[PDB]
Ligand binder design. Structure first.
Ligand code: F43
Ligand code: F43
Ligand SMILES: C[C@@H](OP(=O)(O)O)[C@H](NC(=O)CCCCCCS)C(=O)O
Ligand SMILES: O=S(=O)(O)CCS
Ligand SMILES: O=S(=O)(O)CCS
Ligand SMILES: [K+]
Ligand SMILES: [Mg+2]
Ligand SMILES: [Mg+2]
Ligand SMILES: [Mg+2]
Ligand SMILES: [Mg+2]
Ligand SMILES: [Mg+2]
Ligand SMILES: [Mg+2]
Ligand SMILES: [Mg+2]
Ligand SMILES: [Mg+2]
Lengths: 548, 442, 246, 548, 56
C-alpha cells in the first residue's frame, strides 16, 4: 500500500515525509553521528601513533549542519550510515570485485582436441576428473613435477579452485561432482534448458585464482595464472614430456584461443589490462549477477539487483577509485540501491506497462518510448515534489536523474522486450527532467545524455552498438557517474521480462552460479548490507602470516 | 558530381576569392591542398638541437628530473649545426632531389625537418617521421664528433628519451604535431590527437586560420574513421565548408554583425533569420505564440547551425579575450537554439554533450585542464564528429593571456618550426586556392 | 526571438529571463561597495589585479575577427576572471539553474556560464562581473530566502526550508532577522565574515514567488500540463534519434 | 677467511661443503619439512571446509627425495625454508610492492604559480602548512567542502599521507617537521648537498594512498587518487570557488604536468597502467632502495641491497605472478639474496678492481670489460666446482648464470664508473659460462643474452638506451627471469662506487627516505627475513571491519 | 568478398584503419539499405560486422 520508500523516510527524519519545513544547525555537527564519532577518535589515535596529523573534523567545513541520514539497503531491513556503504569500509563490496577480477572462463575444447589429435590420447570423463583433481592441487600455487619447489600456503589460497560445466547432462554426471557446476541444480527448468542448448557438448572451466594474489597484483594476472597451472596439470595428468612442442598449444589455447576474460583491456589514457571494471560490458555484468536464476518471477527484482551490482562496481570502485579516488562516489551509487526508491518507481512503471500493453507486448518503436518513459519520468519526479523528505534524501540532482531515468528505461524495455528502446527511454527521461526542474545533474552529468538520443540507434564505427555490448569504455560513457550500473539494469530488464536465462554471454551466467564463491551473487543487496554491518568474511587476509 | 551543392569561398579578410565552387572540391578526398597539409603533418618534425646539447652536457635524459651522474658529454652541436643537419639530411632523403627539407632555425638551435613523402607511401603509418629523423640526427651527431661506442647511447637518450622502456618518446628533444599510434582512442583517430595549442601555435593565433586548420584535421579524420562514408558524407563536407572554411562568408558576417555588442543569443537570432531567408528552414507548425521550424535538408541546417556556433564562440570568447567560456558557448548555443526553433542542434546533440563534459573537465578537480590541452582524441572531446574542437582552437587563438597552459607554455617548439610552413600557417588560403583550381574536375 | 515554448506562467518567466528586452524587476538596492564585499575577490579600495597586460600594450598582429569583436572593458584592462555563484531552492525560487545559464548567454557578453543541480556560476572579467553581479543581486533573479550566493558548500537546493522560510546553508551566509523581516548577508560568498552585514531586503511572499518562479512542480504548475513545452522536448528527442541513424 | 656462503652451506647439509657425495631418498619426502607438513594439514582442512580437493602431497611427483633446504637471508642470521620467501607467504614482500605502487611524487611548483597568477593570491610557508594539514585530512578519504559526505574509516587508511621536500632549507625548516622529508637529516652531508642542488627551490609532494585501496584497485589509481585530494585541499586551503576554471589547472598539473609515476604504462600484449612493476625503470628501482644513504661506505652492500629489491619485485611478483603465476619464481630470485653467495662473488670482484685499478679508475672501454668480467666469472664458477654443496644449493643453471653475471657486471661497473660497460660484462659472463659448463639457464634464459652484446652500445630506436633508463619493458628484457633485478644492481654499482646520491632520479631517491613507510627501504633483506618469520605487520587488512 | 579500398583514401590518412572502417560502414549501410532494416534493428547489423568495438 504505502510507497516503498515511506518507511525509510520515517526512519531518517522526525517530521512526516510530506512536511515542507524543518529546523537545522541543532545537532552538534558530526557529534550526532555514531560513525563520525568513531572516525574522530580513530583519527586522533592514528595521528598520535604515526606522528602526522590525519582525520580532523575541524579542517574545512563542519559536516552535519543537517541530519546525517541512515540508509535502508533496498530489499533488506538493514539501516546504516552511508559511510558503511563506502567500498573502503565494506568488505563485501571489495570481495564482490575480487571474485569477478580473479575469475576467468577457459575452454577445454581446443585442449581436448590437442590431446586427441596431437598427443594421440583419449579424453573421457575419467581423464577429465583426474585432470581436475590435479589442477585443484596446482591452481592455488602448488607443484606437480619439479623437485625442490616452494609453494603457497594452502590456507592463504583456500578460495582458489577450478570447476567445469557442460551442456551434455550425461557427460556432466560422469565427472566427479565436486568439480561440476550443475546447470540443472542451479537454474530453473526452462533457463537450464536454454543454457544447456547454448553450451552443447562444449566443456568449459571456471578458474578462480587467489584473492590474495589478485589484490597484490591486477586483473590481467588472472588468465595468466590460470594458464600456467592448467599447463602444469595437462603435463602431469596426460603424461606429456614436461615441456615439449605440444605444451605450447595448451598455453595458446588457455591464454588466447579459448579464454573468456571478464573485462577487455583499455586504451592508454585509462590504461589497464584485462579483468578490470572498465572492460566489463553491461551485458556481462547483468550475467554475473545471479538474481536472474532465483528471482525470475519478479523482473523488477532481477533488474534492480543488477543495478545494485553495477552502481557499486562501476561508480564506487571503478569511477570513484580506479578513475578518481578520495572520498569518492558512495551516494552517487547508493541512490540506486537504498531506501527502496528506485524499486518504488520501477514497480510503478512495470505495473503501468502491464496495464497498458502487457510485458513485452508493446511495439518496439519510438511511440512506445515516448509513452512509457514520459509517464514513468513524471511519476518519479512527482514523488520528489510530494515528499520533501524524499528530495532531501536524494539531495543531488545526479542521483535523482539516474534513479528516475533507470525506472523509465527499465520500464520501456519491459514494454518492448528490447534494450535499445529501453536506452532511448533513459535519454528521453533526462531531457524531460532537465526541462521540468531546470536542472539535471552535476556539471558534466549529461555529456552522454545529450549525445544519447542520436547515438542510441547510430550505426557508425564508434557510435553504434546494442546496449548489451556497450560498457564503461563505450566512448560517451567512459567518464561519468550515475549511468553505468543503471545501463546494466536496462540491459537486464527486457531479458528478465522475457524470461531469458542470460543477457549476453551464457558462459558468464553459468560461471557465477557457484556457492563456492566468497560473495553471494544471488543476493547482492543482502551482501552489501552484511558488509555494512561488518559481518562479511572476505578472502585474501594475511592474518596467518603476521603477528598474533 | 555526387552532390549539387556549391559554395562561395572567401579569404580571412572577408573578401570573395571564388564563387560557385562545387562542395566536393573541398573534400579531403579531392582537394590537393588538404592532401599536402595532411602529408605535411605526417612528415614534419621539429628538432631541438640546443635541447639535445643541453641534455647531453648535464646528462639530464629520460624524462622529468632524470639525470645520470658521470655520463655528461659536452659536444658543440649548435656551433656545428650546419654540418650535422646536412649529414642528417643525406640519411633522411631517399634521393638527392626529392622533397626532403632540413632547415636550421634560431641560429642553429632548432631544425625544421620534412621527411620525404615517399617513405610514407611504403609505410603503414606516420612514425617514420620521428624515427627516421631521430636516428639520422643521432648518427650525424655521433659522426660529427666521433662519439665513442661507450658514450653514443647518451646521444640516443638525449634525442628520443626513455623509449623503448617507455611507450612514448619520454624526454625526447624532437616534437611532432601527431602523437604515437598507441595513444589513439580508436583506429582512425591519429589526425585527432593534435593538441589545440599546437594548432593555435602553428597558425600564429590568427583566429580564422586556427579554426580552418583544426576543421581540416578533424573532418579529414572523419573520412579516415569512416564517419563521412555514405549517408553522412554530405553532412561532413558541409560542416567543413561552413564551420571551418567560412563558406558564403557566413561565419564572418555573423561575427561582423554581433562583434560590437553581441552575445551568444544575438548570434543565434541572426543565424535563425539567415537560415529562414535562405530557405534552409521553414515554419512547420504554429503552437501558442511559438513557431515550430522544420527543414527538408538536415545536413544544411546542421552546417548553418555550425557556422553560427563558430561565430558565437568568436563573439563570446572574443569579447572576453579569455578562452575558458568556449565550453559554455558550445553548450548553450546548442541548448538555446533547440528551444528557439524545435530543430536539433549541431551534430544532433553531440556538440552539446561534448560541451557538457568539456565544461566539467575544465572547471573541476577530476581531469581535463584548460581549453588548449584538449584535442579530438581526448576522451572528453572526442564525441562530436568534428564540430566542437575547431571552436576551441578559435577560442584559444582569441585568448589574450588568461591561461597557464597556453600555447607559449606547451607548444613553443612546435610554433617555431611548424609556423614556418606556409600551408600549415595559412591553410584557408591554400585550400580555397586548390578548390578553385579543381572546380571543373568535380 | 521566441526563447522557450509553453503556455504557463513558468514558461513565460523563462522567456522573460532570457529576453534582454524584458526589464528584470528590481527588488532591492545594494551599494557598489556591498556587491564587492559579497563577491569577496578584492578589498574596498583595492585596484583590480591583472592576469595579463592591457590589450593596448600588446603587439597583436592583424586578425579580422579580433578587429570585429569589441572586448569587454575588463578584457581591455587585463582583469582577472572571477565568478559569482548562486544556489536556487526547488521550493519556488524565481531563477533556477538552466534558466540562469540560458539567460546569461542571451543577456551578457564574454560569459562563461555553468549549470549544476545545486549551483550555477558565471565567470567573466572582474570589473564586468561586478556590474553583472549588481543586476543578479538586485533583481528578480534573486530572493534572499530561496536563493543563496555561495562559492562553496552549496548544499540546500533540494532541502526542506527552515521555519523562517530560509534555504539551508551549511555556512549560514544569509540570516533572516525576525525584527525587520529582512535578510542580511553576514558573510561573503565563500563564507568569510563581513565587517558589516549587507541588507538584502524582505523574502518574497508566497504569492509573489508563485508569480515569478521558473520551476515546474505538481504543487505549482506541472510540466506535464504544459503540453506544448513537452511536445517540443519530445520532438527534439525524436529528431535527434532519427538524425543520428540516417 | 671462510667464503661468505660457508655458514649457510654448513647449516643446510650434514656434510662439509666440500664433500662430493651424499645419500638421498631417506628423509620421508615432504615429511622432512615443517612447512610442507603445515601445508599438507592445511590442505586437508581447506578441502573439507569447501567441499573441493586442494593441496595434496600425493598428486604428481613426491617432493623431498633430496634435502629441502633452509636459506639464509643474506646479511642476516635468519634461516627459513624457501616457502617463507614466496611472495604470497611473505607480508613484507607484499608490502614492499604496495608501498611503491601506492606512491606518487607531485610538484607544487605549477600549483603555486596558478595561485599567484590566475587567482592573485600569496603562497608562503604558512599557507603551505595549512594546505598540508588540509591534505593530510583529505588524502586518506575524508571531506573538506561538501555537506553530507561519507568517508573512509581513518584506521583502515592510517598508512596514507602527504609529505613534502625541497632543496630550499629555509622553507623545509619552517614547515612542521611532521610533513617534511628532511634531506639534511636523512642523507649524509655530501649526498644531501647533491640532492638539494638537484631539487633547488622546487617543492614536491610525496603522496601515499591507502594500501587497502591499492590492493582493491591497481597502480594507475595512485596518481588519480592523489590528484583528487590535492585538488580538494587546494580549493579548501586557498579559498577558490569549489570548481572554477582555475581548478582544472591544478588537476592537469597534479595528474600530468608535474607528476612522477613510479612506473609508466605498458604495451597491449602486457597491458597495464602506470605504477605497475614492468613500468619501473632499473634506475628508479635502485633509487627507491634506500641502502645508498645508509651503507654508502660499502658499495657492494648498496648494490646487492638493490639486487635483492629488484630480484624479489621483478622476478617473484612481476614475472612470477603479473606475467605468469602459480608456484612461480621464488628461487630464481632467492639465489640473488640468500646464503651470502652473490655477496662472496661481488666482494671478490670489488677487491680485484680496487687492487688493480682503484674504484672508478679503470678505462671505460672493452679492455676493462674483458679483464674484469672474465676474472670474476671464473671466480664464481670455480666456487660451484670447489663446493659441491654450493652447486646443489643453486641447483638451477639460471640461478647460477644470474648470480655469476651480476657479480661480473657490478665489478666491471665498479672499475669503469659506468653502467653500460657493466652491462657488457654481464653479457660476456654469460657467454663464458655457457662455454665453460656447456649449459647456461632454462630453455629461454639467454634470449636477451644473445642479443645482449650487440644491443649494449646500439643507438637504434628500440635498441639503444643507457642501462639506467632500461627496465622490464625494454624489448629484449620483457619476458625472462634471472635478469631484471640484477640489472638494477648493475645500474646502482657505478653510482655506489662513485659515491653518487642517486642513480637516475633524485626525486625518487628522496621520496623513499621516510620512516613513515610501512616497509623499511633502508634494509630490504632484513625486511624480507622479518616477513619470512611472520613478524612483519602490513597495512591494508580488513580485520577492523570483519567479525571476530 | 574481396575488398580493396581506393589508394587515395590512404594518401589523405595518417594510417591504415580506413580499410576496415570504410569497408565495415559501407557494408553495414548497404545491408540496411538492401532490406530496409529499421532504426530499431540496424545496430545489430553493425555488431555483426564490426563486433564489440568500441567497448573493446
Ligand atoms: C568541489 C566540487 C567540484 C568538483 O570537481 N568536485 C566537487 C567536490 C567533490 C568531492 C567532495 C569531498 C569534499 O567535500 O572534500 C568528492 C567527494 C570527490 C572526492 N574528491 O573525493 C565529490 N565531489 Ni561533488 N559529490 C557529490 C554531489 C555533488 C553535488 C552536490 C549538490 C548538493 O546540493 O549537495 C554538486 C554538483 C551539483 O550541484 O549537481 C557537487 C559539487 C562539487 N563536487 C563541488 C563542490 C560543491 C560545494 O561547494 O558544495 N557534487 C552529489 O550530487 C551527490 C554525490 C556526491 C559525491 C559523494 C558521494 O557520492 O557520496 C561527491 C563527490
Ligand atoms: C614443466 C617445465 C617446462 C615449463 O614450461 N616450466 C617447467 C615447470 C615450471 C613450474 C613447476 C611447478 C611444478 O612442478 O608443478 C614452475 C613453478 C612455474 C609455475 N607453473 O608455477 C616453474 N617451472 Ni621450471 N622452475 C625452476 C627451474 C627450472 C630448471 C630446473 C633444473 C633442475 O636441475 O632442477 C629447469 C630448466 C633448466 O633445466 O634450466 C626447469 C624446467 C621446467 N620448468 C620444466 C619441468 C622440468 C622437470 O621436468 O623437472 N625449471 C630452475 O632452474 C630454478 C627455479 C625453478 C622455479 C621455481 C622457483 O623459482 O622457486 C620453477 C618455475
Ligand atoms: C578525463 C580523464 O582525465 P585526464 O583529462 O586524462 O586527466 C580521465 N578521468 C576521468 O574520466 C574521471 C572519471 C571519474 C571522475 C569523474 C566522474 S563524473 C582519466 O583520468 O583518464
Ligand atoms: O561540481 S562538479 O559537477 O564539477 C563535480 C560534482 S561531484
Ligand atoms: O623448462 S623451461 O626452460 O622451459 C621453463 C623453466 S621454468
Ligand atoms: K590490486
Ligand atoms: Mg595538530
Ligand atoms: Mg553462500
Ligand atoms: Mg669512433
Ligand atoms: Mg503568429
Ligand atoms: Mg545603486
Ligand atoms: Mg618547527
Ligand atoms: Mg621503521
Ligand atoms: Mg618495521
Amino acid at each position: 500500500a504505502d510507497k516503498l520508500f515511506i518507511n525509510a523516510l520515517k526512519k531518517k527524519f522526525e517530521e512526516s515525509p510530506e512536511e515542507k519545513k524543518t529546523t537545522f544547525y541543532t545537532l552538534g555537527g558530526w557529534k550526532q553521528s555514531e560513525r563520525k564519532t568513531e572516525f574522530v577518535n580513530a583519527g586522533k589515535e592514528v595521528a598520535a601513533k604515526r606522528g602526522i596529523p590525519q582525520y580532523n573534523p575541524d579542517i574545512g567545513t563542519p559536516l552535519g549542519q543537517r541530519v546525517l541520514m541512515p540508509y535502508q539497503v533496498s530489499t533488506t531491513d538493514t539501516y546504516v550510515e552511508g559511510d558503511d556503504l563506502h567500498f573502503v569500509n565494506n568488505a563485501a563490496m571489495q570481495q564482490m570485485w575480487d571474485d569477478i577480477r580473479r575469475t576467468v572462463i577457459v575452454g577445454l575444447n581446443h585442449a581436448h582436441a590437442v590431446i586427441e589429435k596431437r598427443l594421440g590420447k583419449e579424453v573421457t570423463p575419467e581423464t577429465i576428473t583426474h585432470y581436475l583433481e590435479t589442477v585443484n592441487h596446482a591452481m592455488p600455487g602448488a607443484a606437480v613435477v619439479q623437485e625442490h619447489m616452494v609453494e603457497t600456503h594452502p590456507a592463504l589460497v583456500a578460495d582458489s579452485y577450478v570447476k567445469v560445466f557442460t551442456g551434455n547432462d550425461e557427460i556432466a554426471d560422469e565427472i566427479d561432482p565436486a568439480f561440476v557446476i550443475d546447470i540443472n541444480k542451479q537454474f530453473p527448468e526452462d533457463q537450464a534448458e536454454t543454457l544447456k542448448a547454448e553450451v552443447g557438448d562444449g566443456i568449459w572451466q571456471v578458474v578462480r585464482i587467489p584473492t590474495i594474489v589478485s589484490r597484490t597484483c591486477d586483473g590481467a594476472t588472472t588468465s595468466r595464472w590460470s594458464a600456467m597451472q592448467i599447463g602444469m596439470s595437462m603435463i602431469s595428468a596426460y603424461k606429456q614430456a614436461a615441456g615439449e612442442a605440444a605444451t605450447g598449444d595448451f598455453a595458446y589455447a588457455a591464454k588466447h584461443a579459448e579464454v573468456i576474460h571478464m573485462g577487455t583491456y583499455l586504451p592508454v589514457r585509462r590504461a589497464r589490462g584485462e579483468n578490470e571494471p572498465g572492460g566489463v560490458p553491461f551485458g556481462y555484468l547483468a550475467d554475473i549477477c545471479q538474481s536472474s536464476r532465483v528471482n525470475y518471477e519478479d523482473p523488477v527484482r532481477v533488474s534492480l539487483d543488477v543495478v545494485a551490482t553495477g552502481a557499486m562496481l562501476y561508480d564506487q570502485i571503478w569511477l570513484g577509485s580506479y578513475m578518481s579516488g578520495g572520498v569518492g562516489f558512495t551516494q552517487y551509487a547508493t541512490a540506486a540501491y537504498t531506501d527502496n526508491i528506485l524499486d518504488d518507481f520501477t514497480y510503478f512503471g512495470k505495473e503501468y506497462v502491464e496495464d497498458k500493453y502487457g510485458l513485452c507486448e508493446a511495439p518496439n518503436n519510438m511511440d512506445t518510448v515516448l509513452d512509457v518513459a514520459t509517464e514513468v519520468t513524471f511519476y518519479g519526479l512527482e514523488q520528489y515534489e510530494e515528499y520533501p523528505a524524499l528530495l532531501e534524501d536524494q539531495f543531488g540532482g545526479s542521483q535523482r536523474a539516474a534513479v528516475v531515468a533507470a525506472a523509465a528505461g527499465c520500464s520501456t524495455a519491459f514494454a518492448t522486450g528490447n534494450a535499445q528502446t529501453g536506452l532511448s527511454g533513459w535519454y528521453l527521461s533526462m531531457y524531460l527532467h532537465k526541462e521540468q526542474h531546470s536542472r539535471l545533474g552535476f556539471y558534466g552529468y549529461d555529456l552522454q545524455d545529450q549525445c544519447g538520443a542520436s547515438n542510441v540507434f547510430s550505426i557508425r564505427g564508434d557510435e553504434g552498438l546494442p546496449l548489451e555490448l556497450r560498457g564503461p569504455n563505450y566512448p560517451n560513457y567512459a567518464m561519468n557517474v550515475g549511468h553505468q550500473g543503471e545501463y546494466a539494469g536496462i540491459s537486464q530488464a527486457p531479458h528478465a521480462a522475457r524470461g531469458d536465462a542470460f543477457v549476453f554471454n551464457p558462459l558468464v551466467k553459468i560461471a557465477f552460479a557457484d556457492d563456492n564463491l566468497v560473495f553471494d551473487f544471488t543476493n547482492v543487496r543482502g551482501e552489501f548490507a552484511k558488509g555494512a554491518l561488518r559481518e562479511f568474511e572476505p578472502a585474501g587476509e594475511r592474518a596467518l602470516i603476521t603477528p598474533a | 558530381a555526387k552532390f549539387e551543392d556549391k559554395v562561395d569561398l572567401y579569404d580571412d579578410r572577408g573578401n570573395l576569392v571564388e564563387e560557385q565552387v562545387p562542395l566536393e572540391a573541398l573534400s579531403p578526398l579531392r582537394n590537393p591542398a588538404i592532401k599536402s597539409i595532411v602529408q605535411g603533418i605526417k612528415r614534419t618534425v621539429a628538432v631541438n638541437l640546443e635541447g639535445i646539447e643541453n641534455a647531453l652536457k648535464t646528462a639530464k635524459v629520460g624524462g622529468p628530473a632524470c639525470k645520470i651522474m658521470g655520463r655528461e658529454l659536452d659536444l658543440d652541436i649548435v656551433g656545428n649545426a650546419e654540418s650535422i643537419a646536412a649529414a642528417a639530411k643525406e640519411m633522411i632523403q631517399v634521393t638527392e632531389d626529392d622533397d626532403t627539407n632540413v632547415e636550421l632555425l634560431g641560429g642553429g638551435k632548432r631544425a625544421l625537418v620534412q621527411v620525404p613523402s615517399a617513405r610514407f607511401d611504403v609505410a603503414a603509418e606516420y612514425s617514420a617521421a620521428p624515427l627516421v629523423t631521430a636516428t639520422a640526427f643521432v648518427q650525424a651527431i655521433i659522426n660529427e664528433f666521433d662519439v665513442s661506442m661507450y658514450d653514443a647511447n647518451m646521444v640516443k637518450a638525449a634525442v628520443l628519451g626513455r623509449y623503448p622502456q617507455s611507450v612514448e618518446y619520454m624526454g625526447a628533444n624532437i616534437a611532432t604535431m601527431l602523437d604515437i599510434p598507441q595513444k589513439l582512442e580508436g583506429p582512425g583517430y591519429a589526425l585527432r590527437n593534435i593538441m589545440v595549442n599546437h594548432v593555435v601555435a602553428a597558425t600564429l593565433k590568427n583566429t580564422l586560420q586556427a579554426a580552418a586548420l583544426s576543421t581540416i584535421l578533424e573532418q579529414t579524420a572523419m573520412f579516415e574513421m569512416g564517419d563521412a562514408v555514405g549517408a553522412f558524407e554530405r553532412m561532413h563536407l558541409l560542416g567543413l565548408a561552413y564551420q571551418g572554411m567560412n563558406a558564403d562568408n557566413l561565419v564572418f558576417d555573423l561575427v561582423k554583425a554581433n562583434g560590437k555588442e553581441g552575445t551568444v543569443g544575438s548570434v543565434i537570432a541572426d543565424l535563425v533569420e539567415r537560415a529562414l531567408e535562405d530557405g534552409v528552414i521553414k515554419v512547420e507548425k504554429e503552437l501558442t505564440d511559438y513557431k515550430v521550424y522544420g527543414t527538408d535538408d538536415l545536413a544544411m541546417w546542421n552546417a548553418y547551425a555550425a557556422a553560427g556556433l563558430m561565430a558565437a564562440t568568436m563573439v563570446n570568447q572574443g569579447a572576453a579575450r579569455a578562452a575558458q567560456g568556449v565550453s559554455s558557448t558550445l553548450l548553450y548555443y546548442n541548448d538555446l537554439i533547440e528551444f528557439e526553433t524545435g530543430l536539433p542542434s549541431v551534430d544532433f546533440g553531440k556538440v552539446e554533450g561534448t560541451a557538457v563534459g568539456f565544461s566539467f573537465f575544465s572547471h573541476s578537480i577530476y581531469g581535463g585542464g584548460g581549453p588548449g590541452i584538449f584535442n579530438g582524441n581526448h576522451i572528453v572531446t572526442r564525441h562530436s564528429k568534428g564540430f566542437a574542437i575547431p571552436c576551441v582552437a578559435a577560442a584559444m587563438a582569441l585568448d589574450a593571456g588568461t591561461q597557464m597552459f597556453s600555447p607559449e607554455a606547451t607548444s613553443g617548439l612546435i610554433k617555431e618550426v611548424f609556423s614556418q610552413v606556409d600551408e600549415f600557417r595559412e591553410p584557408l588560403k591554400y585550400v580555397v586556392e586548390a578548390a578553385a583550381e579543381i572546380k571543373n574536375e568535380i | 526571438a521566441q526563447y522557450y515554448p509553453g503556455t504557463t506562467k513558468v514558461a513565460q518567466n523563462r522567456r522573460n529571463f532570457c529576453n534582454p528586452e524584458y526589464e528584470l524587476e528590481k527588488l532591492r538596492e545594494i551599494s557598489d561597495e556591498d556587491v564587492v564585499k559579497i563577491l569577496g575577490h578584492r578589498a574596498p579600495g583595492e585596484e583590480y589585479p591583472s592576469v595579463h597586460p592591457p590589450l593596448e600594450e600588446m603587439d597583436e598582429p592583424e586578425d579580422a575577427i579580433r578587429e570585429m569583436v569589441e572586448p569587454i572593458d575588463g578584457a581591455k584592462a587585463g582583469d582577472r576572471v572571477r565568478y559569482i555563484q548562486f544556489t536556487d531552492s526547488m521550493y519556488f525560487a524565481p531563477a533556477q539553474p538552466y534558466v540562469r545559464s540560458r539567460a546569461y548567454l542571451c543577456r551578457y557578453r564574454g560569459a562563461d556560464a555553468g549549470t549544476l543541480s545545486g549551483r550555477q556560476i558565471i565567470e567573466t572579467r572582474e570589473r564586468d562581473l561586478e556590474k553583472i553581479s549588481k543586476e543578479l543581486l538586485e533583481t528578480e533573479f534573486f530572493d534572499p530566502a530561496r536563493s543563496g550566493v555561495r562559492g562553496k558548500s552549496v548544499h540546500g537546493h533540494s532541502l526542506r526550508l527552515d521555519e523562517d522560510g530560509m534555504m539551508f546553508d551549511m555556512l549560514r551566509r544569509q540570516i533572516y532577522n525576525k525584527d525587520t523581516g529582512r535578510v542580511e548577508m553576514v558573510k561573503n560568498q565563500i563564507g568569510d565574515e563581513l565587517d558589516e552585514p549587507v541588507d538584502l531586503g524582505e523574502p518574497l511572499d508566497e504569492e509573489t514567488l508563485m508569480e515569478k518562479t521558473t520551476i515546474y512542480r505538481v504543487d505549482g504548475e506541472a510540466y506535464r500540463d504544459d503540453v506544448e513545452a513537452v511536445e517540443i522536448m519530445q520532438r527534439i528527442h525524436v529528431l535527434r534519434s532519427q538524425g543520428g541513424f540516417n
